[PDB]
Design a protein around this ligand. Structure first.
Ligand SMILES: OC[C@H]1O[C@@H]2O[C@H]3[C@H](O)[C@@H](O)[C@@H](O[C@H]4[C@H](O)[C@@H](O)[C@@H](O[C@H]5[C@H](O)[C@@H](O)[C@@H](O[C@H]6[C@H](O)[C@@H](O)[C@@H](O[C@H]7[C@H](O)[C@@H](O)[C@@H](O[C@H]8[C@H](O)[C@@H](O)[C@@H](O[C@H]9[C@H](O)[C@@H](O)[C@@H](O[C@H]1[C@H](O)[C@H]2O)O[C@@H]9CO)O[C@@H]8CO)O[C@@H]7CO)O[C@@H]6CO)O[C@@H]5CO)O[C@@H]4CO)O[C@@H]3CO
Ligand SMILES: OC[C@H]1O[C@@H]2O[C@H]3[C@H](O)[C@@H](O)[C@@H](O[C@H]4[C@H](O)[C@@H](O)[C@@H](O[C@H]5[C@H](O)[C@@H](O)[C@@H](O[C@H]6[C@H](O)[C@@H](O)[C@@H](O[C@H]7[C@H](O)[C@@H](O)[C@@H](O[C@H]8[C@H](O)[C@@H](O)[C@@H](O[C@H]9[C@H](O)[C@@H](O)[C@@H](O[C@H]1[C@H](O)[C@H]2O)O[C@@H]9CO)O[C@@H]8CO)O[C@@H]7CO)O[C@@H]6CO)O[C@@H]5CO)O[C@@H]4CO)O[C@@H]3CO
Ligand SMILES: *Cc1c(COP(=O)(O)O)cnc(C)c1O
Ligand SMILES: *Cc1c(COP(=O)(O)O)cnc(C)c1O
Lengths: 808, 808
């Protein structure tokens, strides 16, 4: 059908159809007369999977022969989403399969919707891991993704009475055709026990043992025949056992890989979570070393191994690597430490205090006794270095210690990471500067060379070609298909900004996406949106710093203004807000309720008509993002300046033809810088403005007294205007806004509303709106994860990326 | 290589080899240079599996079209063993695969040993289910085996210090290629709740829900292209959910199908066990009814459905069927009951009191409230019938009640079964007569027509062709291969009893089996048996009624006699005793220890040389039985008369060329009757003898005082002769033997020892021993499960078996 979607081919198509039938018959054991749609999905999934195996085996074969430096990406999260379509795209089988399935009388799109999302992530951090795997494979790097195979990923969100209800994400129920169990690589992981000191050194003994079984999932590069591996560990109990109970208690050990903690940028010092962090770390390292010894001095270890820590979650890799080298390989501490620092690198993802991992000493003391001793030793030698560089600065020592004193002694994992890594990077220029000027100022002054920046990016394969084939096509029609793996080329579209034909096509693709999505809402959610209105969407995890509330205030303002002048003209808008709230985050759940409550009032007001609709996008996840983003006109990125490290959703919207309204926060700064501030809708306080507001003191009351429209909104919330049967339902919201708002929602209200008016004014001029859109798309090249990965490779891992196709 | 093993074939072999490679490449994702032996086993397993699918789909297709009466075999146990070789045999692919694997440079036997046993059974009862499935498929019956898919089957037994150590049987760890998950047939099962009475009748409400997911395993008939199904249910928690714990608590619901209770002929009133019994029953019935409505009056239900209860374990099918018909389909009680009785049949497996299921009323009251009411109602109407037939016999009423009074009110499930079934059968003639004369005398007098006998049998496919191809061949060489599916033809061998060539061949096959097994013991168990000695083996679950102890007394006698006259000649013997002891059955575990203790003394006595060896066969199971049985010369079947309902191991030994020494118990009676008492080594008390011994009173001391040799043995056990470091280790054994032996071990000692001497005398005459052997094999035809199943079909289910081959 469309060019960028691959060639069909007589032989190719008849080859797929026959294999589809082989699998339906032999693999699923069924015939066309009893086959269920799920059966069809599986037949196709196995057929496509077969085209990966040859390349997967030869790629892993290639690395064994050439023996290149290996990149190990450790993360407790891999927000993969669906993989059927992504695999077809990277293999160029999309049109062929579409045709073959067509001839077999089946709609492929219907079959793809049957696939369960691999929701092994919470949000930004886990999606970055997923995009990185794709880019690493597309750039020919010998990379391995390592994490945990959770039986249950992020929970499925259902709204009842306007409230969020959590449901277990049993994604493995019908089976996963993409994974391959490798029982022969099972390894033991130790917990508890005690440390024994002998003549030969320390000995960790009397430990409880848990087995780690790996499941490999293929990761195809884009049209280069490279297939890397993502290895996920699963917890199994040893077989070595009144009798019934002993057998049933095996579930205790296997609960380690049972469920993903649903926290987004928030620390929970639970034991189960620590066990998970050590489990993935211990099993991965043994696999790493094993693979290494098959190439005994570890002096060459750093030249053959690079270990990237995605946040502090896998920070135990540092003391674990030391333990093995010192306790097992018998290297001397200093040599061991040199090796450790040279192979490990750390990526920081946030600056908010509640997200920092600080594990109680008593917990590490019981669970990982030897690791605690190693951490103390690391701390000792590290503070000796600080003391020597900054003589007499006793305060600096307390601040830099990996150990935090107080009622409860804790270990600061972020400090552990900085000390044990040769590189520490932020995820956006502004975030990286803040790390050097605030949070890690002391460390930066001690070792300025370790700190770097690596602005995040997204993969143009899944986030453009896959989710917006219509836009990918009209772009390919003018500049070719090379940009798909070299997004910078998108700049060439800059000379089509005045092209009438292009303007019409870009505007038409968007319109089509909106129509398709507008229908989607009625089908599986029976709604009533007007596809001619402006699609105003804010989708991301629900959090106070994200300020979904500021968005809510604007929506209530629009409503009040309409009611004030019913017969005045206003640009119609469909406001969509979606995202999951972590269970137990009360405020976050109150916000979802408030949003649905507003929709309940606004959506049923005869006077408003279809000029304003408020929709809460239920169960937001990767597969839903692939749908709503291509259909958006306005991207809401309004976090208080200095709180959103980088953000990646913002890049998704820019690449897909939506305009951005946001603060100078995270990557927003670099995006506006690339497109030109005039092509961005920037508003609100900048970082410094937040700073001198705190020094002076934030008094929300001041804004309430000076802004009539704001005052009215607050009075409506308090009086029960949005909760008739429960007048004080939102007393907590108002209370927080008026007396304890850490994120200064009122401070940016006026500027936000005004900027929103300029957005509406521009939407009234279709041609100019679209021309600004073209300028955003044309400059979104920098935000491709290919660029990001190429920088990590050259500036951190010390390996050269290659686009050379591997033999077919 | 051998005739009965199928034809190779040019096309056939090159077709297997290529498919073997397809699977190794595409299914296991590997190449010959990294493939592990397990990988090879799986490639072959998937290849063979592919040859089943066509027939499996057409067989199930056939039944749908013809719509024959369906047989549902309910059992909580299916002792399947390995299925790779069995499948090849029934498909006649054994030689072809052997050749194809040979050409690929692989030893098939080595690959078969990699397969895990499906140990979803304890012993006799579960193996009978397995043999029945094979026969039902071989006789073209539209039969379905229904049970539970236990994550952990019978535990693996390991001996340490002479003691039994239990290990979890994690048989699904590497995966099961034979099963097929059918998520679309998932059904809900209810527990707890309460009964609500309305205008429309009773309503079971506020129940906890557990889902039942089926996994189908193919069951191939012998060379007839029929492939039946064994559907095993797995417990899953519903998805409808502080947050972490709720997710982790899902394991509570899923623990229902986690492990098989390891009890052999012993009742454990545990809640988990009851839940298992209802779980398999409720899910199976819904499946049965669903399939029925697709052929609404249930008057025809009994003509289209037969439900066989393997013991009382699935007895809840009776009140469950009533519940559905009355509470859901709204039929009137009497009609419902007529239907129930006509579709259900019950098979009794034992008469020992400790095996009878008596569930506490309070348990059924909490877990299955409505079922308790239905049982009470059934009991009421049933006793009204007894009262009418036996006016004034108040005692008879108490005895027959399904409800047993006392400190704790219980429900007698066996009484429930008799009342709700149109047929009740014993498993051996003598066992069935005992049911009518004792245990169920009252029921028999009330309804003599319900009671029947169906002597057990074993499948000649697995128990001859598969485990003893050498014997199968030399027999086929003279009478053809028709006997494999018509064992009666084995009688034709009766006219070869004087044939010199046959005598030499039969004796040679045995010798070969003994050599192969004698080596096996050294390889994986590093032992030292003499293959020229008589193989004396007793393999079965360890139990006091089985009297492994009587065997022990004989072994100690032989030893003491040798030590008395060291230079006297005695026929050398290798005594093998194997079997698992249920955990918590103290006495059973003491017996295993005693056996190993004897071996420790006997096996290291220089004076004994290799004239006497005592070996304890570790981890006895189906796959081990297939090895030791073909190699045995003497089969020990010495249970106290009247305790072993039937036995099936006895039939296995007879079919494989071993002579039998045993009591007139269970099927032993019918076997000796078929071969002729002169060709059997019968000894000990008969049922009546046990009876007048009890009436008089059993005084073990009397035997101890009158038998010098017996006295010496007891003194040795007490003095610590077999436990030097622990003098009173066996004080409990002696105590039980002397004061509380329910099984009268001493009563049969003298006769047992003497009979054992006649066995030795016969072994000294090779030619005559072998001629007697031929007479046993030649008459073992009656014990084929094909005969057994044909009788169930005609006399109980009302369906005609057929040997007609189904189109290929
Ligand atoms: O594995 C090492 C030890 O681990 C564990 O210790 C951890 C603590 O439990 C944890 O609380 C935290 O320590 C913090 C501490 O609690 C806070 O009080 C604070 O401490 C600062 C203090 O307030 C400042 O005064 C200053 O200390 C200076 C000190 O006053 C000054 O005298 C000098 O110190 C020199 C010593 O005087 C001199 O004897 C010599 O010390 C040798 C030592 O003899 C030798 O054995 C070896 O150290 C051994 C040690 O002896 C063992 O006891 C064992 O220690 C472990 C603890 O038991 C654990 O509880 O093993 C050690 C091996 O490393 O080597 C020493 C020299 O390296 O030289 C000293 C010169 O440095 O100068 C210091 C300047 O630092 O600073 C203190 C730190 O800011 O803050 C602490 C950090 O948060 O973390 C501990 C692990 O780091
Ligand atoms: O669902 C039915 C009931 O279920 C539950 O009851 C069970 C008991 O809990 C459990 O213990 C066991 O019962 C045993 C009992 O505990 C023992 O004591 C013993 O009882 C025997 C007794 O010792 C003997 O004397 C003899 O009883 C005779 C009786 O003495 C004599 O009078 C005559 O009985 C006639 C009645 O007199 C007459 O009124 C009439 O009864 C009607 C009844 O009116 C009508 O409602 C209906 O029965 C209802 C009943 O009324 C409800 O209470 C309800 O009963 C349930 C219990 O509540 C549960 O606890 O529902 C019933 C619906 O079936 O129909 C009755 C007639 O069928 O006619 C009677 C003529 O039969 O004769 C009897 C002769 O039997 O024998 C007793 C039994 O041997 O042994 C009991 C069995 O172990 O089991 C109970 C369920 O079976
Ligand atoms: C891209 C993405 C995110 C990250 O969004 P931000 O707005 O940067 O927080 C979160 N969830 C999903 C499903 C995503 O696709
Ligand atoms: C045949 C068999 C049994 C039954 O043996 P009996 O001696 O009748 O109790 C038990 N276990 C296995 C493994 C069997 O093969």
């Amino acid at each position: 059908q469309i060019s960028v979607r691959g060639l069909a081919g007589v032989e190719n198509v008849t080859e797929l159809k026959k294999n589809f039938n082989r699998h339906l018959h032999f693999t699923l054991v069924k015939d066309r007369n009893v086959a269920t749609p799920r059966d069809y999905y599986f037949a196709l999934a196995h057929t496509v999977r077969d085209h990966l195996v040859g390349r997967w085996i030869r790629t892993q074969q290639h690395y064994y022969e050439k023996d290149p430096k290996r990149i190990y990406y450790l993360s407790l999260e891999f927000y993969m989403g669906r993989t059927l379509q992504n695999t077809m795209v990277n293999l160029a089988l999309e049109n062929a399969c579409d045709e073959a399935t067509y001839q077999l009388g089946l709609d492929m799109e219907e079959l793809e919707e049957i696939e369960e999302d691999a929701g092994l992530g919470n949000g930004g951090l886990g999606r970055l891991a997923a995009c990185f795997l794709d880019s690493m494979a597309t750039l020919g790097l010998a990379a391995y993704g390592y994490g945990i195979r959770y039986e249950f990923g992020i929970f499925n969100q259902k709204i009842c009475g306007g409230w969020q209800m959590e449901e277990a994400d049993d994604w493995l129920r019908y089976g996963n055709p993409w994974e391959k169990a490798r029982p022969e690589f099972t390894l033991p992981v130790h917990f508890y026990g005690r440390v024994e000191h002998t003549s030969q050194g320390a000995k960790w003994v009397d430990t409880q043992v848990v087995l780690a079984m790996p499941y490999d999932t293929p990761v195809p590069g884009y049209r280069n025949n490279v297939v890397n591996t993502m290895r996920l560990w699963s917890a199994k109990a040893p077989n070595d056992l009144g009798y019934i109970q002993a057998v049933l208690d095996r579930n205790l050990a296997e609960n380690i890989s049972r469920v993903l903690y649903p926290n987004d940028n928030f620390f929970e010092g639970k034991e189960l979570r620590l066990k998970q962090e050590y489990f993935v770390v211990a099993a991965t390292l043994q696999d790493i070393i094993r693979r290494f010894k098959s190439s005994t001095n570890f002096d060459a270890f750093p030249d053959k191994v690079a270990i990237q820590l995605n946040d502090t979650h896998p920070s135990l890799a540092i003391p674990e690597l030391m333990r093995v080298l010192v306790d097992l390989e018998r290297l001397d501490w200093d040599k061991a430490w040199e090796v450790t620092v040279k192979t490990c690198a750390y990526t920081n993802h946030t600056v908010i205090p509640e997200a920092l991992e600080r594990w109680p000493v008593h917990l590490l003391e019981t669970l990982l006794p030897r690791h605690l001793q190693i951490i103390y030793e690391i701390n000792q030698r590290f503070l000796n270095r600080v003391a020597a560089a900054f003589p007499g600065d006793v305060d600096r020592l307390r601040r830099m210690s990996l150990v935090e004193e107080g009622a409860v002694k804790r270990i600061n994992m972020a400090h552990l990471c900085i000390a044990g890594s040769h590189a520490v990077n932020g995820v956006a220029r502004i975030h990286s500067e803040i790390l050097k000027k605030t949070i890690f100022k002391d460390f930066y002054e001690l070792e300025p060379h370790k700190f770097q920046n690596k602005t995040n990016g997204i993969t143009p394969r899944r986030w453009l070609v896959l989710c917006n084939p219509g836009l990918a096509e009209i772009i390919a029609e003018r500049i070719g298909e090379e940009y798909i793996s070299d997004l910078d080329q998108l700049r060439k579209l800059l000379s089509y900004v005045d092209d009438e034909a292009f303007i019409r096509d870009v505007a038409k693709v968007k319109q089509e996406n909106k129509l398709k999505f507008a229908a989607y809402l009625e089908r599986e959610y029976k709604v009533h949106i007007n596809p001619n209105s402006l699609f105003d969407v804010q989708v991301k995890r629900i959090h106070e710093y994200k300020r979904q509330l500021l968005n809510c205030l604007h929506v209530i303002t629009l409503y009040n203004r309409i009611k004030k002048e019913p017969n005045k003209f206003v640009v119609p808008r469909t406001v969509m807000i979606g995202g999951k709230a972590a269970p137990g985050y009360h405020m976050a759940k109150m916000i979802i309720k408030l949003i649905t409550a507003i929709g309940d009032v606004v959506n049923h007001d005869p006077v408003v008509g279809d000029r304003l609709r408020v929709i809460f996008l239920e169960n937001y996840r990767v597969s839903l993002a692939e749908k709503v983003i291509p259909a958006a006109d306005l991207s809401e990125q309004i976090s208080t300046a200095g709180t959103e490290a980088s953000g990646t959703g913002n890049m998704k919207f820019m690449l897909n033809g939506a305009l951005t309204i946001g603060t100078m926060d995270g990557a927003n700064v670099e995006m506006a810088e690339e497109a030109g501030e005039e092509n961005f809708f920037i508003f609100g306080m900048r970082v410094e403005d937040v700073d001198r507001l705190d020094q002076r003191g934030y008094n929300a009351q001041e804004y309430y007294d000076r802004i009539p429209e704001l005052r009215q909104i607050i009075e409506q919330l308090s009086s029960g205007f949005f909760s008739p049967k429960q007048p004080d339902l939102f007393k907590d919201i108002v209370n927080m806004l008026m007396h304890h708002d850490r994120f200064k929602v009122f401070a940016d209200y006026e500027e936000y509303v005004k900027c929103q008016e300029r957005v509406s004014a521009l939407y009234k001029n279709p041609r100019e709106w679209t021309r600004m859109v073209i300028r955003n798309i044309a400059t979104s090249g920098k935000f491709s994860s290919d660029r990001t990965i190429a920088q990590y490779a050259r500036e951190i891992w010390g390996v050269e990326p290659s686009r050379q196709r591997l033999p077919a």
